[PDB]
A paper describes a structure:
[name] virulence factors are members of a family of bacterial nucleotidyl cyclases (NCs) that are activated by specific eukaryotic cofactors and overproduce cyclic purine and pyrimidine nucleotides in host cells. Here, we explore the [name] Multifunctional-Autoprocessing Repeats-in-ToXin ([name]) [name] effector domain (Vn-[name]) as a model for [name]-type members that interact with monomeric (G-[name]) instead of filamentous (F-[name]) [name]. While Pa-[name] requires [name] filaments (F-[name]) for maximal activation, Vn-[name] is selectively activated by G-[name] in vitro. The catalytic domain of NC toxins can be divided into subdomains CA and CB, with the catalytic site located in a groove at their interface.
On the basis of these structural data, we designed a minimal functional Vn-[name] module (residues 455–863) by removing the C-terminal disordered residues 864–895. This Vn-[name] module (shortened by 32 C-terminal residues) shows similar catalytic activity to our original Vn-ExoY412-873 construct and allowed the determination of two additional crystal structures: (i) nucleotide-free Vn-[name] bound to [name]-ATP-LatB and profilin, with a sulphate ion in Vn-[name] NBP (Vn-[name]-SO42-:[name]-ATP-LatB:profilin), and (ii) Vn-[name] bound to [name]-ATP-LatB with its NBP filled by a non-cyclisable ATP analogue 3’-deoxy-ATP (3’dATP), at 1.7 and 2.1 Å resolution, respectively. The Vn-[name]-SO42-:[name]-ATP-LatB:profilin structure is very similar to the structures of the VnE/VnEDM-PRM-Prof chimera bound to [name]-ADP, with the Vn-[name] switch A similarly disordered. (E) Structure of nucleotide-free Vn-[name] in complex with [name]-ATP-LatB and profilin (Vn-[name]-SO42-:[name]-ATP-LatB:profilin). In our nucleotide-free structures of Vn-[name] bound to G-[name]-ATP/-ADP and profilin, the Vn-[name] NBP is still only partially stabilised by cofactor binding, showing that cofactor binding is not sufficient to fully stabilise the NBP and catalytic residues of NC toxins, as previously suggested. 42 to 46 of the 53 residues from switch A are still disordered. A SO42- ion is bound to the Vn-[name] NBP via residues (K528VnE-CA, K535VnE-LID, S536VnE-LID, K554VnE-LID) that coordinate the γ- and β-phosphates of 3’dATP when this ligand is bound. To reach its most favourable binding position, the nucleotide must move ~4 Å (distance between the SO42- ion and 3’dATP γ-phosphate) through the LID closure.
Residue numbers in the entry:
A (entry chain C): 1 to 139
B (entry chain A): 5 to 44, 49 to 375
C (entry chain B): 466 to 683, 727 to 863
């Protein structure tokens, strides 16, 4: 599918290190993602935690995206006009951690992970703008 | 072009320029309007000027418990800050404003709209007060206990991001402590009830109060000797002796039942806040407890928090309380740090972004 | 052993020498105790060395506000402000009309009185023998006074000194030839005590702990209260205060003898082994401190280093206080004097934020 063009668009300005568009209805699957990165390995169990009815068990010790442990910073998944979650990876020692935003549309999750030092607000705005474009195209 | 940093407190406005190590202006957060409200000197007075003319004006606090409640009066405060205190044209400076933890979405949207539409700032950013205090300590992960004049919060923060699900609020802060000290001195036969008497008691509180390491032991010492007594000269020339009131007043932070509140104390809400965070970050929070705000200035408060948190936590947990000497102003100082970094230019909301998205741009960009 | 914090490097003082100060050491000890009790850093401008005995006598008042007439540096009036400004320093002698008008207006406005000048025996001995400012006194028969002349200023003017008893004290009254006739010499005196004004203790700067900074209930009430504590501690008779409320204009003048050597007084924790930090040493290792606790600041560079050490220790000049402290700026700007805790935190945050 021509979904790779959306990944190229998200990765164009050099602020992000990973990006993905994931269908979450029925049997979830990665429609498009940056090859060899983390989001490409997202599982249906991980999608289930992101979109699940329970909005508190992921505060015990976070959640994973492609096996990468993340903490939830803001859960705006059920907030009108946002439908997003902001996360930050969890690593060891002085290893860098990165901001992630997930935005939910009618049929997809748009996921974006920033490079080191890229502010979560920049990633959230970028993810929001792509999700808005997809909603206009009935996705 | 220099960015401006404004910390709008329930009690005091702290304002200045990014890159400076202290605010240039610190003034009371009050607006005074004429008592005569008819039709046939000035529409309003702000801060220092408002208090001087207290006899002819009705004074109000536009921020209650850290949240803006009177928007018309808040615009008067911002106008005064820019034009009278800082002497700058707001349209020439990017402006960093602070907000309380858990500030409603409608309030942060209105603050954004007022900055761009009323003051025409070129860019702006809204930061949570406690996060800026953590930056002023040279950290990006930790848990801040911020207690000012109007509200107290425990705010755990991961890499510069406050964790709202774990924030705890205690609706008890410096003003309630002043009112409690007024009540317990009045119980001795003195009379501290008026607005002017409230200011005398606030001065007694700031000068002589402290946090006891062991409250019951300190009460027993106060009842068996005069070793803890201090004298204070009142404006009329009378001398009042402050004894167990010196430590009973801030003890209310640890025991809110003293003022009839059923809330847990600041040590218990610190534990509760840490426990609402991921298991993986809890050791880092316990080792990085930063105190900020005027109500954390009591001598002995860091040693008391160290003892109380040690008693709650697993015995093997490494606990550290950081209480910087400049903590009355660490929110402002942290804002000056953030707004002076080259990474800030990518964080601010520009007028172009505001024109494209409207006030809800503050949800996306500021957290 | 060496002190280091960012770009501030101070090497321990090798072979510390004693520095001559104008302020009597009895008063230096008082100010050292005030700095400790009030937990403030107090800086005082140098006092002219020759006026020390005048101040130590505790008989005179000190220079108040609104007095623009100049003091004298010659004759028996040395250290005082003569009503006739032809007897003042050279700058007044070359602008007589201007300075005589300042002296007369200070008396007409109630800010001063015209007072007789009495000197003690210590002063006569200093002027004749220690400083050789006056020629040896020669007794006259007709007046019963001793004639002398100055060895600097206008050496042709005779002065006449008379032994008098003023309230159980044996003093010398100064007389001169006013329009050719013997008359009592007049100096500017305080309007309450009526006593001649000597140099005062002019505060250079006051640096407070964070707790004492911020808005005030009432141009500063915090400085007014500290000045009252200082005058109370100095214990002079009511009306003979050495420190005055308020401050005169900044003035477009400089001269090193007017700002250095300054005497700073600091809280006693600065003198401990961990005074400047955990293992950074005591303040007296890097700054010249005398036996009375006076921290002696000799030049603008030392002042800048001292100010940085004080700001690093969370002592700052108030926002509400107005000072003209600086002179010969090595780097006396806002950006150059930022606290090292601020700069270190900014560096740490920049690193953590990916910069
Ligand atoms: N030395 C001190 N000891 C105790 N309390 C103090 C001290 N100094 C200031 N305070 C108190 O701190 C309060 C002001 O602190 P601060 O400026 O942090 O509050 P704020 O930012 O205006 O309020 P908030 O953040 O609650 O909206 C007042 O209640 C004041 O009496
Ligand atoms: C010196 C000072 C301190 C302060 O914290 O002031 C702030 C703002 C102030 C506003 C009213 C007051 C009469 C004006 C100015 C005093 C400002 O109210 C406070 O004093 C209130 C009332 S008593 C108390 O503890 N907080 C706090
Ligand atoms: Mg505050």
């Amino acid at each position: 599918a021509g979904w790779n063009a959306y990944i190229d668009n998200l990765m164009a300005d050099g602020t992000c290190q990973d990006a993905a568009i994931v269908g979450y209805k029925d049997s979830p699957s990665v429609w498009a993602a940056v090859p060899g990165k983390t989001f490409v390995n997202i599982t249906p169990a991980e999608v289930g935690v992101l979109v699940g009815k329970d909005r508190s068990s992921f505060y015990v010790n976070g959640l994973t995206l492609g096996g990468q442990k993340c903490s939830v910073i803001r859960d705006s998944l059920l907030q009108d006009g946002e439908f997003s979650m902001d996360l930050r990876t969890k690593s060891t020692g002085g290893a860098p951690t990165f901001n992630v935003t997930v935005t939910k549309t009618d049929k997809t999750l748009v996921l974006l992970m920033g490079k080191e030092g890229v502010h979560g607000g920049l990633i959230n705005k970028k993810c929001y703008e792509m999700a808005s474009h997809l909603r206009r195209s009935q996705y | 072009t220099t960015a401006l940093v404004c910390d709008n407190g329930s009690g005091l406005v702290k304002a200045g320029f990014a890159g400076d190590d202290a605010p240039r202006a610190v003034f009371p957060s009050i607006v005074g309007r004429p008592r005569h409200q008819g039709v046939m000197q000035k529409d309003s007075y702000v801060g220092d000027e408002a208090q001087s003319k207290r006899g002819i004006l009705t004074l109000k606090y536009p921020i209650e418990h850290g949240i803006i409640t009177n928007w018309d009066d808040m615009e008067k405060i911002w106008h005064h800050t820019f034009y009278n205190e800082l002497r700058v044209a707001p349209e020439e400076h990017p402006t960093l404003l602070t907000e309380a933890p858990l500030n409603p979405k409608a309030n942060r949207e209105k603050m954004t709209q007022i900055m761009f539409e009323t003051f025409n700032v070129p860019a702006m950013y809204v930061a949570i007060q406690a996060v800026l205090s953590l930056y002023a300590s040279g950290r990006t992960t930790g848990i801040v206990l911020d207690s000012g004049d109007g509200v107290t919060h425990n705010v755990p923060i991961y890499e510069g991001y406050a964790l709202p699900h774990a924030i705890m609020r205690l609706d008890l802060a410096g003003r309630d402590l002043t009112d409690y000290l007024m009540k317990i001195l009045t119980e001795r036969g003195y009379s501290f009830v008026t607005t002017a008497e409230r200011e005398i008691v606030r001065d007694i509180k700031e000068k002589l109060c402290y946090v006891a390491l062991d409250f019951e032991n300190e009460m027993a010492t106060a009842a068996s000797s005069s070793s803890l007594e201090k004298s204070y000269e009142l404006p009329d020339g009378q001398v009042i002796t402050i004894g167990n009131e010196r430590f009973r007043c801030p003890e209310t932070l640890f025991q809110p039942s003293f003022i009839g509140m059923e809330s847990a104390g600041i040590h218990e809400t610190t534990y509760n806040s840490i426990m609402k965070c991921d298991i993986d970050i809890r050791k880092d929070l316990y080792a990085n407890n930063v105190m900020s705000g005027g109500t954390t200035m009591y001598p002995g408060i860091a040693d008391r928090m160290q003892k109380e948190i040690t008693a709650l936590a697993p015995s093997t947990m490494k606990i550290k309380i950081i209480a910087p000497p400049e903590r009355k102003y660490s929110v402002w100082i942290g804002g000056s740090i953030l707004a002076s970094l080259s990474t800030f230019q990518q964080m601010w909301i520009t007028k172009q972004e505001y024109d494209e998205a409207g006030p809800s741009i503050v949800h996306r960009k500021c957290f | 052993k060496t002190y280091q914090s960012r770009d501030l490097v101070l090497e321990p003082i090798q072979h510390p020498k004693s520095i001559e100060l104008g302020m009597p050491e009895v008063d230096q000890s008082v100010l050292a105790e005030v700095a400790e009790r009030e937990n403030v850093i107090i800086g005082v401008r140098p006092v002219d060395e020759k006026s020390k005995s005048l101040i130590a006598s505790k008989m005179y008042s000190s220079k108040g506000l609104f007095v623009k007439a100049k003091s004298s540096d010659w004759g028996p009036m040395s250290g005082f402000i003569p009503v006739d400004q032809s007897f003042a320093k050279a700058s007044a002698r070359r602008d007589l009309e201007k300075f005589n008008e300042y002296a007369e207006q200070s008396i007409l406005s109630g800010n001063a009185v015209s007072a007789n000048l009495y000197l003690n025996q210590v002063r006569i001995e200093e002027l004749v023998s220690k400083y050789e400012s006056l020629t040896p006194l020669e007794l006259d028969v007709d007046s019963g006074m001793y004639k002398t002349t100055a060895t600097n200023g206008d050496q042709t003017i005779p002065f006449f000194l008379n032994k008098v008893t003023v309230d159980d004290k044996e003093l010398w009254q100064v007389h001169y030839l006013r329009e050719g006739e013997l008359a009592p010499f007049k100096v500017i005196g305080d309007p309450v005590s009526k006593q001649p004004m000597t140099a005062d203790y002019d505060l250079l700067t006051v640096m407070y702990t964070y707790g004492d900074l911020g808005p005030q209930d009432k141009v500063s009430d915090r400085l007014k209260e500290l000045k009252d504590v200082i005058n109370t501690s100095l214990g002079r008779t009511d009306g003979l205060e050495m420190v005055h409320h308020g401050a005169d204009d900044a003035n477009p003048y400089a001269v090193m003898a007017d700002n250095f050597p300054a005497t700073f007084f600091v809280p006693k924790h600065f003198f401990d082994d961990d005074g400047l930090g955990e293992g950074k040493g005591s303040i007296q290792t890097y700054f010249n401190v005398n036996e009375q606790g006076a921290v002696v600041i000799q030049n603008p560079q030392e002042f800048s280093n001292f100010q940085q050490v004080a700001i690093n220790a969370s002592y700052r000049a108030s926002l509400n206080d107005k000072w003209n402290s600086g002179l010969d700026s090595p780097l006396f700007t806002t950006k150059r004097k930022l606290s090292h805790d601020y700069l270190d935190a900014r560096d740490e945050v920049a690193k953590k934020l990916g910069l």
